[PDB]
Design a protein around this ligand. Structure first.
Ligand SMILES: NC(=O)c1ccc[n+]([C@@H]2O[C@H](COP(=O)([O-])OP(=O)(O)OC[C@H]3O[C@@H](n4cnc5c(N)ncnc54)[C@H](OP(=O)(O)O)[C@@H]3O)[C@@H](O)[C@H]2O)c1
Ligand SMILES: NC(=O)c1ccc[n+]([C@@H]2O[C@H](COP(=O)([O-])OP(=O)(O)OC[C@H]3O[C@@H](n4cnc5c(N)ncnc54)[C@H](OP(=O)(O)O)[C@@H]3O)[C@@H](O)[C@H]2O)c1
Ligand SMILES: O=C1C[C@@H](c2ccc(O)cc2)Oc2cc(O)cc(O)c21
Ligand SMILES: O=C1C[C@@H](c2ccc(O)cc2)Oc2cc(O)cc(O)c21
Lengths: 334, 334
């Protein structure tokens, strides 16, 4: 009955969100960059079996190309995002495109006239970078009023700086635009996302949350960096993320931005669990021993306050199906 | 101006509840077993400088003795509770009298005819003892549907068994009674309570949370027992518990039982924080190193879903003032 658009149907979170929407009885429209690439989009034919799913070609770099996909939709889930750290001139190759691609899609929402709410998928990368609070030696609970320090990041350009800046600025810009055109925009801010999805060529979070099993050095360094900063990592099941996105679309009183997170283990806790549950990978939990650090953690309360309920609540439930996904994707060798 | 009764004004939580009630403009009646004991009850004189405070004598074993104190009260906070010392017949000396004493006070609430709500202070001792969830080696999140297993406890009588059975049965019987007599009963279930209160003789109530600084062997054993069971401990600040109790009395939609908890450190996290903030006590965090264990934790969501907010959200804030209190009580030498 109601219709929704999901940008980046070939993506990890995008594919999972399409599945939820179809299961929930939505007509769905999704965009990919090359609808003919079955290497990336073989899942779309399968998803079509669950309900009305229509595929469009669109590129965030190409103005107006989202017009057709967004037309008629009651809800638009802005999931697709450049990402890809690369380097060189991040300001012109990551940040500016990130901002413009977002406004590109926003304008299609205005053109459609039908869009009752836009859900923007951002990231706690736009929340956590508070150099006043990291390194003061105290614990902190960061909430939705916390914004990553764009000025400090541009001045000092630490690792992943363009990523946090991209997210902060595209969120601010989309909110300004939504303000100006009287469109309702809600933003969700996930932590590390765990779990299986329809997408056949995903990597993204799966590499990181599986890095103790694969030994992938980039993912391992990412996990250790988060813990050295926060004293913990933060995790959420992809299906809870998708349900939170739909919750925010459907509940009229939802407003502003929302952290989405459920379980906050130390790496030693996470490695201990993984080594017991999946001994075939040889995880050594002592590889992740660390002194206790003050906790700089994310508040889970806003979604809870507004009535949302997570279904994957223990560490084991958060890891209920990601290993098999990683195997199928070749991220894990067996 | 509404009027509220707190049973057991001499006690740790009771004195803190009275203080909050006066600050929020309530007239307060409280009970002690010997109003003439001004050593034990000096704080009640002090608190009278905040607002109307009236002391009554009453005893849970003495039928009717609470009549005068609850009379004319809008709300009644049932806080008083027996200390519980190893008894030859726990059923006859502890469990049955805990039920009867609770009913005794319930009756006085009915008799008053004015009691909008009764708030029962209990504890997660009535929640956590689950032979399946504790022994199955998996992580779990317990919520307010979880009750300690009275039959298993009577069958195997582990340590503290009588304390849990007492809490479970007295809560069940008080709800039975409240149903039949048409009086609203809400129950709060705190975890370990930390922080300063007005009571001058409350030594025994904060022994555990300071045991790392004091070396109190009984307190250390309790902390380790809980960690052995749950993989962590659970803490809440006494002032958040008091604020939660007031919230549950004042908000008509509140119903049933509520866990009250905020911060769940491992012992090594707790010890590390204490060692650095209060080095003068020679805490050795390595004394508390431990294997990562499946987390059997408490859900914090019910109070949050209903709009309550905690003010002591970091480990440091939860410990913001308890050390000075322990000095004043003589738990800590300096
Ligand atoms: N995964 C996590 O742990 C996590 C955590 C926090 C936040 N998030 C946020 O959630 C969003 C989706 O994350 P993901 O893990 O699903 O990443 P993903 O699998 O790489 O999906 C990203 C999608 O964006 C599309 N895309 C990129 N540039 C495009 C362009 N110019 N035009 C059209 N489409 C374009 C991509 O299509 P192509 O494949 O054709 O390039 C891809 O399908 C991201 O914004 C992420 O930052 C994720
Ligand atoms: N302290 C914590 O960390 C914590 C944590 C979770 C739950 N709780 C629960 O909160 C409740 C209050 O705890 P608390 O720490 O405040 O203990 P407390 O300081 O010992 O206060 C309990 C009060 O009960 C009174 N009392 C005992 N028997 C009585 C009787 N027969 N008649 C009248 N009064 C009687 C006592 O007054 P007398 O001096 O006259 O005996 C005492 O003041 C308890 O049920 C506890 O189980 C406490
Ligand atoms: O954008 C983010 C945020 C990042 C993060 C998590 C926790 C934290 O405290 C800080 C940053 O984790 C991620 C992990 C991914 O695989 C892909 C992502 O896009 C991201
Ligand atoms: O009633 C309880 C329950 C106990 C507890 C906390 C957490 C847990 O997981 C299990 C039991 O903590 C306490 C600590 C006290 O000083 C006094 C108490 O009366 C109690």
């Amino acid at each position: 009955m109601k219709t929704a658009c999901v940008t980046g149907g070939s993506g990890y979170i995008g594919s999972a969100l399409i599945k939820l929407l179809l299961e929930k009885g939505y007509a769905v429209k999704t965009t990919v960059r090359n609808p003919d690439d079955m290497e990336k989009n073989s899942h779309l034919k399968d998803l079509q079996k669950l309900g009305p799913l229509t595929v469009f070609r669109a590129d965030m770099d190409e103005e107006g190309s989202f017009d057709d996909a967004v037309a008629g939709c009651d809800y638009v889930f802005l999931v697709a995002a450049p990402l890809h750290f690369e380097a060189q001139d991040p300001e012109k190759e990551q940040i500016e495109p990130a901002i413009q691609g977002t406004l590109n899609t926003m304008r299609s929402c205005v053109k459609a006239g039908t869009v009752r709410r836009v859900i923007l998928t951002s990231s706690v990368a736009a929340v956590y970078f508070r150099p006043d609070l990291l390194g003061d030696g105290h614990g902190h609970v960061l909430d939705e009023d916390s914004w990553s320090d764009v000025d400090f990041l541009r001045a000092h350009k630490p690792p992943t700086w363009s990523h946090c800046v991209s997210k902060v600025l595209l969120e601010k810009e989309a909110g300004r635009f939504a303000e100006e055109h009287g469109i309702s925009l809600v933003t969700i801010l996930p932590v590390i996302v765990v779990g299986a999805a329809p997408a056949p060529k995903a990597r993204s979070s799966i590499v990181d949350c599986l890095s103790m099993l694969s030994g992938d050095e980039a993912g391992l360094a990412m996990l250790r960096a988060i813990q050295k900063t926060s004293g913990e990592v933060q995790l959420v099941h992809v299906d809870d993320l998708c349900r939170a996105e739909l919750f925010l679309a459907e509940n009229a009183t939802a407003n502003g931005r929302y952290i989405c997170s459920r379980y906050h283990p130390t790496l030693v806790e996470l490695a201990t669990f993984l080594a017991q549950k999946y001994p075939q990978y040889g995880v050594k939990p002592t590889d992740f021993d660390d002194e206790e650090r003050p906790r700089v953690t994310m508040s889970l309360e806003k979604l809870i306050r507004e009535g949302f309920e997570y279904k994957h609540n223990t560490l084991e439930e958060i890891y209920d199906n990601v290993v098999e996904y990683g195997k199928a994707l070749g991220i894990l060798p067996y």
